[PDB]
Design a protein around this ligand. Structure first.
Ligand code: GTP
Ligand code: MG
Lengths: 154, 44, 482, 160, 67, 48
């Protein structure tokens, strides 16, 4: 991993709201798929996501279907329910990506960006060479040189 | 039918058999169980 | 949907075990009811339309099998390839998946050739005419056709038939390496110590059977040894002695050991030896190492005035030619000297270089497909640049291409690695085949690549219009029932 | 037809390290050259900075020099050859003509009558065919002659 | 044991004869050699058996489609 | 020959057949690559 510096975390929903621009950008989604496939694990959530989003993109310039007014509000609530389903289908994916990426990085002897967990290796966030001399969230002092997660041979 | 009808009218259009003309349609359906009521914790 | 009726066709292979639960592949690979006759007119048996390609030993592959797909068992894969596989070959073979190989017509040619090498002394005239006097072949083509794969297959054919086989799975581990030491006992030559060590390791464990029978005609019987260790009497024993040591000792040991190993190989005239090198074209020009600036050799008082620039400015010194690598020296020695018709080089080319079109920006580091490619940008002609007989390889023709794609998709789905329950989202096989043809140009690496990318196709309308028609038909049926 | 970046990103609100976004002078752009352009830290505008490092035209010029180096570098790694200056007599039949200087005439075909159409400019000669010409002094040939492949010979690819 | 090279089915035989006839009219791109012609014929027959497979898998898929 | 146990069939007749069969097969193979514009080459490649 080349990008090492401390970062700003964005809530999952705003990441998903980027649609085609980032979250569903074809290019990105394909190399996620590559990671999964190479690990020998089906990519179902990715495929659900890709389906939902593919279709989002196809109809993205159309006006929504005409609404008739109801005291029930069954329509509004069914649209909502469907929507939060899709949101959750994608939360699951977003989680999977962060999960597997961290795990794979643990196998590749990769050091993550500052303040990032790698389950077996760095439990509290890993940090080295931050702009700030302490670990940001522990409030503990950082050693020089940067802490090493892996034994030396390569 | 008229050869004209079968030359010009035998294609998919918003008249004939349109693909959905509207936003926010159902992309993905599956057979699944229902989740618990209010699975989300109210927070912070 | 004939799912719960489905039993599983009992397991003989690694390959037959690669099948996932029915629930996963059910729509994707459709079931059918076949009525045969036992004890009652039928007894309904549910079979799947598709099954993984057969798992076939190299000796079972026949002329009749060309352009078909065959599988390699996982443990045969472990037996025959402890070095690794060719450059990208393993990208089609994740852990659950079956290990496929398209048996091409050139594959059959080299299979015949190797099967003759097995007893060469009888077939000497035949062989020599088949290469036209050169020592083996170099296979060349565009980036991403079957080259590295073809080499894999040759290693498989050779090692299954119990021939002694050097396999260098990627030449770039030598010539474009981690680091480069001057060799210990060969003045003026160089080593790639890491390449060399790993080689000495896997070579030994692959050929161990034959290499333990091999007695040393020339190696010193005095080799330096730690207390409680044994003087090697075999070629295997020697290779062992090469890589089993604590570093730094491994480094000088490996030099000595490679020199003597190659000296031993060139001295064996009766036992067929097949040398497979992937990316020979890296061995025929310079390595990316440069000779150390001479001021590293002369010792120094201050940088202040020695009349030395080594600290001020970087500069390029002439590259070290690969022929000055002690290993490559060994091989060249066997190629160029006549009176060695014991040895067969079946060797390969790699075009894996970074793209350069006349301007280069800086590569975006997030999106770069070429980050692990070489910097080369200089042309290579197998005719002028090697002593081997060149054989050319193209992209798949449609017969190959179809068999290969069918494999990637369907045996992928059977292994639970593909659309699965979502199968109705992707288009039918024919459409995928035609489209992936257009996108890939039928280049094999392109086919693999676009097969993955298919996940993202926007503009495919087939399943949409089909779904629509099936619906209309169901509703007319419901209006006729009414 | 390169995919690489040839343009420095425009100055805006401070970019931060995010999904989908990195800092402007981040170490990952232009192969880490951005070091040269970087003012580290929460820069105090009034008192501190180096003006040229925020200037669009200047910054872009620097980046353009760096790109030029990249291309030059790769064009030279691409050469396997030297230019030797050989007297008119001793040169192969194709160069016995007049050869307009670069960008002077239409890009020129080596030998249309013999069915070779290619830039004479970029035609490269083998050091082994020019041996007699380049090292006349040496007596015995220094490089051993190229061995060539019989394309009429029955070999593995002809299915015999 | 051994396999035979010569055409196995009546189908192979028929296509093999066709390929011969094409070779004798000297049309462009046709294999001159009998081995190549065999490989060609086998490969073709196999391709058509594949096409039939995909058509069957389609007819079956059509019934279990979601809507 | 070598599996029959050398129980005499007039073993020399067997070996005579062997040498003859071999001679004809060689002749036929090499002929298959040489003759008829080499059309039958792959017989030679396969079995030689
Ligand atoms: N099973 C099988 N797969 C193949 C065959 N040829 C190509 N492939 C697949 O397609 C990919 C083609 O990549 P390589 O074979 O590594 O390409 P290459 O010719 O070595 O090209 P460079 O190394 O880039 O010069 C391989 O990784 C295989 O997965 C083949 O003959 N049989
Ligand atoms: Mg390769």
């Amino acid at each position: 991993n080349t990008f090492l510096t401390s970062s700003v975390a964005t809530p999952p929903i705003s990441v998903i709201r980027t649609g085609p621009k980032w979250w569903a950008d074809p290019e990105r989604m394909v190399r996620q798929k590559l990671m999964y496939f190479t690990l020998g694990v089906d990519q179902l959530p990715l495929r659900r996501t890709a389906v939902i989003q593919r279709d989002l993109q196809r109809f993205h310039m159309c006006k929504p279907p005409p609404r008739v007014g109801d005291s029930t509000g069954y329509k509004r609530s069914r649209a909502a329910q469907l929507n939060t389903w899709y949101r959750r289908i994608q939360y699951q994916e977003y989680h999977m990506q962060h999960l597997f990426t961290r795990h794979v990085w643990g196998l590749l002897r990769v050091y993550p960006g500052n303040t990032t967990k790698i389950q077996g290796k760095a439990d509290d966030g890993y940090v080295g060479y931050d702009s700030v001399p302490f670990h940001r969230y522990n409030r503990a002092p950082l050693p020089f040189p940067a802490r090493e997660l892996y034994e030396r041979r390569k | 039918t008229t050869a004209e009808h079968k030359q010009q009218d035998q294609f998919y259009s918003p008249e004939n058999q349109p693909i959905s003309l509207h936003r926010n349609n159902i992309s993905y359906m599956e057979d699944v169980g229902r989740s618990v009521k209010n699975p989300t914790v109210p927070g912070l | 949907s004939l799912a719960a009726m489905y039993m599983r066709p009992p397991v003989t292979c690694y390959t037959d075990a690669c099948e996932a639960p029915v629930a996963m592949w059910d729509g994707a690979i459709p079931l059918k009811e076949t009525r045969k006759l036992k004890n009652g007119v039928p007894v309904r048996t549910v079979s799947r339309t598709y099954s993984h390609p057969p798992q076939l030993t190299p000796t079972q592959l026949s002329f009749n099998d060309i352009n078909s797909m065959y599988c390699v068992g996982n443990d045969e894969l472990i037996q025959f390839f402890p070095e690794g596989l060719g450059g990208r070959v393993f990208q089609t073979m994740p852990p659950g998946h079956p290990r496929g190989f398209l048996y091409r017509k050139e594959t059959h040619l080299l299979n015949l050739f190797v099967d003759k090498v097995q007893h060469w002394h009888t077939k000497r005239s035949v062989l020599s005419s088949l290469t036209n006097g050169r020592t083996g072949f170099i296979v060349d083509g565009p980036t991403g056709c079957g080259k590295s794969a073809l080499m894999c297959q040759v290693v498989h054919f050779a090692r299954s038939r119990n021939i002694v086989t050097l396999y260098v799975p990627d030449a770039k581990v030598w010539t474009h390496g981690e680091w480069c030491w001057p060799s210990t006992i060969l003045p003026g030559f160089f080593d790639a110590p890491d390449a060399a060590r790993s080689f000495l390791k896997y070579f030994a464990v692959a050929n161990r059977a034959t290499l333990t029978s091999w007695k040393l005609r020339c190696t010193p019987k005095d080799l330096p040894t730690e207390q409680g260790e044994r003087q090697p009497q075999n070629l295997y024993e020697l290779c062992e002695w090469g890589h089993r040591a604590v570093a730094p000792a491994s480094i000088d040991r490996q030099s000595v050991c490679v020199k003597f190993l190659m000296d031993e190989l060139s001295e064996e005239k009766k036992l067929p030896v097949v040398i497979v090198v992937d990316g020979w074209n890296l061995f025929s020009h310079e390595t990316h190492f440069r000779y150390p600036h001479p001021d590293f050799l002369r010792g120094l008082a201050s940088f202040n005035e020695s009349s030395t620039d080594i600290d001020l400015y970087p500069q390029e010194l002439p590259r070290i030619p690969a022929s000055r690598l002690s290993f490559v020296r060994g091989l060249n020695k066997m190629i160029l000297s006549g009176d060695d018709p014991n040895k067969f080089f079946i060797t390969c080319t790699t075009r894996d270089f970074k793209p350069f079109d006349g301007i280069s920006g800086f590569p975006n580091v997030e999106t770069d497909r070429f980050a692990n490619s070489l910097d080369e940008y200089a042309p290579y002609d197998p005719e002028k640049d090697s002593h081997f007989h060149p054989i050319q390889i193209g992209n798949f023709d449609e017969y190959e291409y179809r068999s290969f794609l069918r494999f990637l998709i369907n045996s992928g789905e059977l292994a639970g690695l593909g659309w699965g329950p979502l199968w109705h989202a992707s288009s039918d096989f024919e459409r995928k085949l035609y489209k992936i043809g257009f996108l890939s140009g039928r280049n094999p690496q392109g086919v693999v690549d676009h097969y993955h990318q298919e996940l993202v196709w926007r503009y495919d309308y087939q399943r949409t219009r089909q779904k629509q028609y099936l619906l209309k038909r169901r509703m007319e049926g419901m209006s006729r029932g009414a | 037809v390169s995919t690489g970046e040839f343009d420095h990103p425009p100055f805006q609100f401070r970019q931060r390290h995010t999904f989908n976004t990195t800092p402007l002078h981040d170490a990952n752009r232009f192969g880490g050259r951005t070091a040269y352009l970087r003012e580290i830290g929460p820069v105090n505008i009034k008192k501190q900075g180096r003006r040229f490092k925020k200037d669009p035209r200047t910054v872009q010029f620097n980046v353009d020099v760096w790109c030029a180096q990249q291309t030059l570098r790769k064009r030279w790694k691409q050469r396997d050859w030297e230019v030797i200056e050989i007297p008119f007599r001793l040169v192969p039949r194709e160069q016995q003509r007049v050869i307009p200087e670069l960008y002077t005439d239409i890009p020129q075909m080596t030998d249309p009558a013999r069915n070779d159409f290619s830039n004479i400019r970029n035609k490269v000669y083998d050091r082994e065919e020019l041996q007699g010409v380049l090292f006349p002094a040496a007596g015995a040939m220094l490089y051993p002659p190229l061995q060539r492949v019989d394309k009429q010979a029955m070999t593995l690819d002809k299915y015999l | 044991m051994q396999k035979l090279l010569s055409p196995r089915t009546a189908r192979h035989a028929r296509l093999f004869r066709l390929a011969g006839k094409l070779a004798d009219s000297g049309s462009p791109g046709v294999p001159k050699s009998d081995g190549e012609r065999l490989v060609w014929v086998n490969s073709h027959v196999r391709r058509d058996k594949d096409i039939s497979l995909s058509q069957e898998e389609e007819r079956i898929r059509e019934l279990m489609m979601p809507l | 020959m070598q599996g029959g146990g050398a129980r005499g069939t007039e073993r020399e007749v067997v070996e005579r057949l062997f040498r003859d069969v071999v001679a004809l097969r060689e002749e036929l193979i090499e002929e298959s690559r040489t003759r008829f514009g080499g059309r039958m080459r792959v017989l030679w490649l396969q079995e030689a």
